[PDB]
Design a protein around this ligand. Sequence first.
Ligand SMILES: *[C@@H]1O[C@H](CO)[C@@H](O[C@@H]2O[C@H](CO)[C@@H](O[C@@H]3O[C@H](CO[C@H]4O[C@H](CO)[C@@H](O)[C@H](O)[C@@H]4O)[C@@H](O)[C@H](O[C@H]4O[C@H](CO)[C@@H](O)[C@H](O)[C@@H]4O)[C@@H]3O)[C@H](O)[C@H]2NC(C)=O)[C@H](O)[C@H]1NC(C)=O
Lengths: 209, 209
Amino acid sequence: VSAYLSRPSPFDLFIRKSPTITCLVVDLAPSKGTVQLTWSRASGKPVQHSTRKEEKQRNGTLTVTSTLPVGTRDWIEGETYQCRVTHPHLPRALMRSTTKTSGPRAAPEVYAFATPEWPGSRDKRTLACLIQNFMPEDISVQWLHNEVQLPDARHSTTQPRKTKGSGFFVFSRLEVTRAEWEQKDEFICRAVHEAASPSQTVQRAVSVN
Amino acid sequence: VSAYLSRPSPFDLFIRKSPTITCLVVDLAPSKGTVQLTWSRASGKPVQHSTRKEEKQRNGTLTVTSTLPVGTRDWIEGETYQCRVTHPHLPRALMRSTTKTSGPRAAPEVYAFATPEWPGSRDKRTLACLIQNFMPEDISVQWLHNEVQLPDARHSTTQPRKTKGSGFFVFSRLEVTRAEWEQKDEFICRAVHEAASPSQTVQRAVSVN
Ligand SMILES: *[C@@H]1O[C@H](CO)[C@@H](O[C@@H]2O[C@H](CO)[C@@H](O[C@@H]3O[C@H](CO[C@H]4O[C@H](CO)[C@@H](O)[C@H](O)[C@@H]4O)[C@@H](O)[C@H](O[C@H]4O[C@H](CO)[C@@H](O)[C@H](O)[C@@H]4O)[C@@H]3O)[C@H](O)[C@H]2NC(C)=O)[C@H](O)[C@H]1NC(C)=O
């Protein structure tokens, strides 16, 4: 049995301003309807109501996820949140905690590129975005077309990796359609990161032609 | 304790024609004793001598790997190699096997890009390479300068992620210096892959300019 606790996404924390964290306990093969999941704050102040979601996955094991909304100011000023997991056949209850990452800050460089045409793909292009030299590693990426955000399912972002320096990079990939670039040939890759000043966004336009 | 058996790198398999497979055992509680990694072939034929290697990691974990050279024809013609792990305090002996993945094939698309100058730091640029729409996921990516291959640690390549199509993609980042592009302003990203005819190889250059 293993447990994971995430931090809020920069997007939710800075753009939507409704940050949440998620406690994920995995690999709970056997059943005894009572995998207790308890939230609290390191300061002792009260936590909000959380949602619960337990799903049998077809690898023989059970997954349970609980999401807790947190205060925007509370998280930025450095509160630490904690998820204690009590299982029925537990030896000891398992504790996980989360807080904003410490260390130096550094704004991401953003660069946006369009691929050329490949044989057998006249009506689509791939756009890629390189976002690099940021710290800490938490970052969201959003793509915009017609001054609106495209659904997130439409792009994929790689996991943060260390650069040869002390900063991190991710790449983001987004396939687009002729209908889109012809209607408006400008796509914006926008990084959301706390060190980006002000407004926590740095962004870059690219066009297909 | 968790064990992993990797397939040979395409580079080693198709270009150098000396493929190897690696049994990776990660032991998170280093007990006294000797972990045993023992190799065999499903056919029962002889296996070559292997290299064993151990290192206590910074976070207390023991890491044992064993690397076994394999025949090129044997691998290509679908031989199955098996790694048997024996821990001192093992309940059961762990087993892992690996074999050629034989689903559908599709060549990779390669696209190479160079960032413009970031204000201030002009003694460096970042080169990126997108390799996409390939299957299966097995791929070797390398960078070249003066028709000569640079050291692996110079680049960072992401893990095969699924495209929206059926294929996989990977990004690769290489920072270069101004000394390098002034010596010769041409860097090649080369992808080695099972399905990249005519020579298992496709590559694309890019210039800093
Ligand atoms: C039985 O089958 C189940 C699912 O059916 C498998 O469950 C998965 O198990 C893995 C590994 O335990 C889980 O992966 C973990 O995800 C964590 C974060 O969530 C991910 O997904 C959310 C999307 O909502 C993203 O926000 C986030 O970025 C992640 O993509 C990670 O934090 C964990 O990573 C940590 O440990 C890994 C090592 O595993 C490090 O490399 C990481 O850097 C980090 O330290 C981890 O990746 C996965 O979430 C589970 N799936 C689901 C659907 O919940 C069982 O593993 C499987 N059991 C067996 C034995 O095969």
